[PDB]
Amino acid sequence: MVEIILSHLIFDQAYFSKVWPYMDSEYFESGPAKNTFKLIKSHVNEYHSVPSINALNVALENSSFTETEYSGVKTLISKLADSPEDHSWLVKETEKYVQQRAMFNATSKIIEIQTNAELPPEKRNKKMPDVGAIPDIMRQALSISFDSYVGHDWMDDYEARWLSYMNKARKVPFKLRILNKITKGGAETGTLNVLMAGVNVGKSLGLCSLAADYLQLGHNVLYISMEMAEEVCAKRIDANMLDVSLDDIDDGHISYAEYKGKMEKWREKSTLGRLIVKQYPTGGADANTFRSLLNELKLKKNFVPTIIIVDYLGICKSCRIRVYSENSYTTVKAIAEELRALAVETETVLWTAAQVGKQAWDSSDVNMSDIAESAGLPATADFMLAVIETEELAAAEQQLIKQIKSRYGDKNKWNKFLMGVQKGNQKWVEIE
Amino acid sequence: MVEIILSHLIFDQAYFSKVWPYMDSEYFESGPAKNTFKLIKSHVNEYHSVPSINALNVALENSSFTETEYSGVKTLISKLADSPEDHSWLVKETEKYVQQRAMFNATSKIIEIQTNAELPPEKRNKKMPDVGAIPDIMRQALSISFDSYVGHDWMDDYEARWLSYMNKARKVPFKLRILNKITKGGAETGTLNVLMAGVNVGKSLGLCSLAADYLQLGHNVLYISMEMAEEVCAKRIDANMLDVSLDDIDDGHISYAEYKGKMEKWREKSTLGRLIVKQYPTGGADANTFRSLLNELKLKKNFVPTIIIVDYLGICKSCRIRVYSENSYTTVKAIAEELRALAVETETVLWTAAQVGKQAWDSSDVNMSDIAESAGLPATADFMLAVIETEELAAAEQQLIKQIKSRYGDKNKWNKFLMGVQKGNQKWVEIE
Amino acid sequence: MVEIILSHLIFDQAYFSKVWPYMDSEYFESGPAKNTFKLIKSHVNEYHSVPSINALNVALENSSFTETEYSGVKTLISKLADSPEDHSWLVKETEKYVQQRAMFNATSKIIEIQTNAELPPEKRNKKMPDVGAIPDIMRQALSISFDSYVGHDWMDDYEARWLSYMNKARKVPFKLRILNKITKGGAETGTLNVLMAGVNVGKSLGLCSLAADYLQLGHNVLYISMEMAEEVCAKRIDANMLDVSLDDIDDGHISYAEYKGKMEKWREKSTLGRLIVKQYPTGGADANTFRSLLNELKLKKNFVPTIIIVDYLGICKSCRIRVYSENSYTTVKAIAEELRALAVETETVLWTAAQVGKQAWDSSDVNMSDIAESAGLPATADFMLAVIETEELAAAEQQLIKQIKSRYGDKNKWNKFLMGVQKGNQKWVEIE
Amino acid sequence: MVEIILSHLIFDQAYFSKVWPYMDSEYFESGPAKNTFKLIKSHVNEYHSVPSINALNVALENSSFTETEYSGVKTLISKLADSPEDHSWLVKETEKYVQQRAMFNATSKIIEIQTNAELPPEKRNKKMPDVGAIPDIMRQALSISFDSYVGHDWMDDYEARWLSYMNKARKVPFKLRILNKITKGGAETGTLNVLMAGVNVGKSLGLCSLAADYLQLGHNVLYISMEMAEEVCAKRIDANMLDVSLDDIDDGHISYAEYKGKMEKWREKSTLGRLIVKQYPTGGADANTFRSLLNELKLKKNFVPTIIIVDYLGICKSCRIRVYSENSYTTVKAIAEELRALAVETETVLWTAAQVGKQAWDSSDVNMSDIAESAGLPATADFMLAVIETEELAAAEQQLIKQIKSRYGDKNKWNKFLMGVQKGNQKWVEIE
DNA sequence: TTTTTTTTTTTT
Ligand SMILES: Nc1ncnc2c1ncn2[C@@H]1O[C@H](COP(=O)(O)OP(=O)(O)OP(O)(O)=S)[C@@H](O)[C@H]1O
Ligand SMILES: Nc1ncnc2c1ncn2[C@@H]1O[C@H](COP(=O)(O)OP(=O)(O)OP(O)(O)=S)[C@@H](O)[C@H]1O
Ligand SMILES: Nc1ncnc2c1ncn2[C@@H]1O[C@H](COP(=O)(O)OP(=O)(O)OP(O)(O)=S)[C@@H](O)[C@H]1O
Ligand SMILES: [Mg+2]
Ligand SMILES: [Mg+2]
Ligand SMILES: [Mg+2]
């Protein structure tokens, strides 16, 4: 019903006020319709008013159109008329038409993406999204509607604000009381949590400490390690939970009898979850691979995680961008968005560990202008912490957390606090 | 376009009074259009009024034209309608048509001058202007504009300027008597105004107080927050407007009945504006994202603001610098310039806040030299109010407001004044 | 490649044990391929074993098909052979085929959903899902990778993990007691180890000392020089092994007999290994050249090196990135990743040097931030030691070695230790 | 015999091991042969194994070339079949075929370069090499003989190594005793030695003194000046050799009789080489230019230098990086590496000058970190000497030479000694 | 959009 839409854009005002901000040139066929809409949009952009028939016939004459295009536009303009109908069926019909056009465009785009992917390298188009980006596009098209929320309107959105006042989101508590204090009860389900740190300063130590703490609380924890072997991460967890140093395990100070006894003592406890460590090669795993892993864990082991942990965000595959196509910032932002989408879909608290820039290394204080790969990670993330064990905290067997971005509470309340990192047992103890 | 021009010369008054002095016979054609315009001009010269269709036909009957000219003029006269187009588009389009025709005539004239110049000197026309007159002729073609407004012309716009001083066309009052006293009637449109907060003063309390005061005066306020969510800023706004303490909302002392009653009481009042709160991540909002936000609000929400309040200048990002620093002087200077450019181009009062220098923190008196942003903020800021909160003032629930830069009026007239800050309701009350 | 898939399903148990878990009739075709796979699936369901050609033909006789389908199935069944192709290529190709067929089916399904949505509610089928099911449908078709391994469990696999604790075959001792002490048993196979210092401090001296120490332990050492000639580095190795001097070799203080005697005495030792020195022009080699060099070395001589020393990573040339395609942070990190991949493929200890920026060329200490090339090298590295020499140290002939990145052990247990570097002999001497 | 080569690449493991490392895509054809080899090479790079006929067919079906190419590749693959053969006839025939194809490609590229250089500029299709590197390409066409040198074995090849210590043909002695003492016999051929002084401290006086000293010791010296005329450098050499001050030549205190007598007295001495001075405009000479100069010197003037001197490397042009494309670091490092490559190619002692940073000027000490244009120059230079002059040293007619990078010996020993530079005679004298 | 060299400048 393109002709009706154009006719009521020209000859009606309430319809124009209701539907114009959502109309786009891509919703019209490449014939007379798109060119007529181009003329209307140019006139509105230049004069901030709805053009008349004379205005468009003047705009058509002052246009660089071929004979076929000129004839089609003139015929379409001649065919326009103000058919009296109701301003409740027109709006819904226009919304349906726009949604259908958006779905059609998305389908064509994903077909083109799949055709582009199968092409051999050095011939395939670049900057075109890969196959893994197909669902996201299909998520955007279904979101088209003639209702748009731009900002929070005082006196117009106050019931929702009162609900936000009275209601509080559910929280997965930590085992460290300081994190609960700074997060008002823990972390929410569909979140992307990042623990940035320098190189060789405790990115995996903190993640393994969190994994052990969550495992002792009865959660199903999935540790996806992209840099370390499964046995290494499981040895970190064992050191955390069996109270044996990594030096003792490697040197063989502990015997198999004591190890088995401690493992069985932990097994007999009812307040214990299941921790599963999966190793992927560097750059060999993405969000879709994680979803396949979750599906096989559910089907073959009856395992549904809650505390999915990714060792390093910067190593994982983009899943939306082809490898070595965009810059580090865009690729890491895409990875963060994909991981947060996975966390929201699976209702799992997702924890990761990015790397800070070379400047932040051995720096007593860090800020958001220290992230190495991408500064867009805080925007995508829901809670971001830092590690500041630079020069003298190591001698005192301590650490420091900056709280760069905390969406659960206020970052400027307990911004910097001291953590008792114990590297032999790979754990965090509190200074209290 | 000529048909529209002639029709709206015949059947309009404002268009005629606006475009008649810039209308010439040579601008139309060498056929029916020129003859019709000659008839119109002859009628308006003999009778100083716009001719009617019957009078035009009578003049055409009593005129010296051949058969083809008679047919063309009759058809064109029969093809003129009193249709109603918008005035701005009509004036702009007829101006463009006149300019194009004048340029074509001048180019043809200079080509004819050049052709006559390359002719035997014994054999040439004397009336044709010499070649040296070519640059001037084109100038007369370029000096064709229905309305000349290039800047403010002294001695030529003194009557309009006086209407600005009497009507205070630029001032926006403050709702606080002291702030109106030192600004000679409030802040001005197209200005950047900042608050300098010493140690122990919040930057968002004063901004929320100003936003509430503007809201109570009927102004559309756009509050862009960086370090806080939309709900938190709107909660500060509610605290100030509903007289409820900030902690009372979190505790639950105020019930839904009182909240809704107060909100509907405010909604009943016709002297209330609209407040739109938009949240952006730290460092993820330059003064080009604000332009997009304004465009979206105007197109979708029809919300065109008169007050724009940015939560914190330091948290913002300089679009030109691109690189971002937590506390760098070059970025603050660029951010201030970009925000003031936005205020000027949008004709809105723009408010922001900054932290004073550490020396300014310790000293109750704050010097422009004692500012974290030196030569960057006291150079791009029309007004820079300084807020001092010492122990004695806090014990008395007061803050010392000092005026550090006042483009509006004399800085030393009323430099120091005590403000009744309420930290619970986030409000500024005057002191007798 | 349906014929290959079916042939290796029937005639290969290893292929059947990794692909049958993930296989459906929708993946193959709508003609003879689907019918053949349906026969195979029916036979394996009725009898839990892979069918044979005779059994498949008997089942085809028992099953009922139309004439065309019967002929197609007979023709396809006739075309099955063992054809022992590579397992890795076969599984990768069948994974690709399954993924592409699943994507095609998902696209057709969403197109059918969209077509059914446009139908009137009376005409539309209730079995097809709504448009809201379009995204997840496209997502479940992107999570069909072939991977049955779920990973460690920490409670169901602690016996295997303890057995893995006893697998110390990855460790390679250092011949220096301090290095073994700080590495908890020496370096590990398939790791990128770096020895960084300033210009003219002894990086190649340390590399040659490590080469000699590994040679005296019976290892095969491959020294790849990027600046010096083969005979020059071999002179340093001779100075380390024969233990006379560098100048005495060039000053004639060693007669040919003594040289012959010492070389033959070292030949008589059964604890000595093999050392090959290879030189490359600056910026002309990487793992691609190194892999061909490894293959040529293995073919020409019974030499599979356990230790691979690269004179400098920076002088090396990246495989994919051109000579000056991108900046240092990229291509240097790319070369580091390629070298680590080569080491983990060959299961060899990889040693290389790194340069330090000018800021730490005359400093008593050097940090990880003082890496002249990309900071991604101290991300792919595993044991990045650092060599610091001052005037006081050079007076005592004692270079200081600082533990910069220690992945094997605790980086701060023995952070700084003094060595006994003898520059004339190109040897590192432990200090007791 | 491309079919045989491909067939035995497929059906012969022994053949593939030797021929593959050398096979390249530019040795077969522009049609079916190249496409088949590209398929095989892609399969080998993806799976590290020789593809089978089924694998080749599968890759052919998943390929994007047209119908003609597809049919040609299919026919070629169908024609591939193993035949009873012998390893030797095949390896020798393959070597002959590869050499012939390399020669054919080389001569085609030579013709293309000749027909491209004979074109008007700005239309010469840049990125094509100039005529200067016409023979070098041919030299690459002859260095393909299936006989890659694996490397040098420490124990297997030590008689050849020992017959390189008393040879001493690599070292070229100085004339000053201190420089010989610190370098333990003088500089070595195929090296890059550098003087760092600053601006107007020396650094060309030292180069001229070295040139004169080498010339007196029966050497052919090639001075290359990028910033001075051929007569200024020759005047400096005349002042050095004839023991006549530059002021005396300027002021005419030396007669033609004395000049002629001294020149003839030098000529009649047998212990004297030939010095040739060549001038190039600043930034208008590179390694290829120097090689062309060497060739034309050998042919036209039968002059074979051994002590090639370049006045300043920083003033030369890189032969690989486009001008002003990369920063100073990369460009200067590349220039120094190319100069060292030239020196090792022609087996000459290469001497050069380098500037220091602005901070090192008028300083009593110059460190290695004070190098001006690149930190890579010290890393890619065999020997560097820093020339330091203060007011006290200038008043004493002495300069302090500090050993900054001493690759021929220990720099800690004799790090700073005082030369007796005489600026009038452009000569260095010792103080011993 | 980050990254790294070198320089030059300026601000604190
Ligand atoms: N086997 C070990 N025994 C004792 N301490 C260890 C051992 N391995 C590592 N550590 C310590 O643990 C610290 C943190 O190491 P990681 O957990 O790997 O941090 P990291 O950020 O993951 O390092 P990356 O991934 O290489 S950037 C190191 O700095 C060491 O001090
Ligand atoms: N014609 C001359 N007569 C006498 N002394 C001279 C003459 N030319 C140069 N000198 C001296 O030689 C010193 C060093 O000369 P150079 O070798 O040209 O210095 P330089 O470092 O090569 O110059 P740049 O900046 O590198 S091009 C100067 O400082 C003068 O004292
Ligand atoms: N022929 C020699 N005789 C004695 N000492 C030497 C000799 N060559 C080098 N040295 C010493 O070796 C030290 C550093 O050796 P190098 O291996 O050259 O250091 P490096 O520059 O980091 O390694 P490169 O650049 O890859 S050769 C110097 O400071 C000298 O003291
Ligand atoms: Mg880690
Ligand atoms: Mg070096
Ligand atoms: Mg000079």
Numbering used by the authors:
A (entry chain F), B (entry chain A), C (entry chain E), D (entry chain D): 1 to 432
Task: Cite, word for word, the article reporting this structure.
The T4 bacteriophage gp41 helicase and gp61 primase assemble into a primosome to couple DNA unwinding with RNA primer synthesis for DNA replication. The domain architecture of the gp41 helicase resembles the bacterial DnaB helicase13,14 with an NTD and a RecA-like CTD that are connected by a linking helix (LH). The gp61 primase is composed of an N-terminal ZBD and a C-terminal RPD that are linked by an 18-residue flexible loop. Here we report a series of cryo-EM structures of T4 primosome assembly intermediates.
In contrast, the other map (map 2-II at 3.4 Å resolution) showed the gp41 helicase bound to the ssDNA template that had undergone major conformational changes to become a planar ring closing the gap between subunits A and F and likely represents the active helicase configuration. In contrast, the third state of primosome assembly is represented by map 2-II at 3.4 Å resolution and map 3-II at 2.7 Å resolution. Both showed that three major conformational changes occurred when the ssDNA template-bound, open spiral of the gp41 helicase transitioned to a planar, closed-ring state. First, the N-tier rotated in plane by 60° with respect to the C-tier leading to a domain-swapped packing in the closed state, i.e. - each CTD now aligned with the neighboring NTD. Second, the linking helix (LH) from the N-tier relocated to interact with the CTD of the neighboring subunit. Finally, the N-terminal helical hairpins (enclosed in a yellow, dashed-line shape) closed in a scissor-like motion that increased their crossing angle from 100° in the open spiral form to 165° and almost antiparallel in the closed-ring form. In the active gp41 helicase, five ATPγS molecules were resolved in the C-tier with the nucleotide-binding pocket between the CTDs of subunits A and F unoccupied. In the open spiral gp41 helicase, the ssDNA binds to five (subunits B-F) of the six helicase subunits and coils inside the right-handed C-tier spiral, as compared to the activated helicase ring in which the sixth subunit (subunit A) now joins the other five subunits to coordinate the ssDNA phosphate backbone. Therefore, the 10 nt of the ssDNA stabilized in the inactive open spiral is increased to a total of 12 nt stabilized in the active closed ring gp41 helicase. Importantly, the scissor-like movement that activates the gp41 helicase exposes a hydrophobic patch on the side of the gp41 helical hairpins, which recruits the gp61 primase.
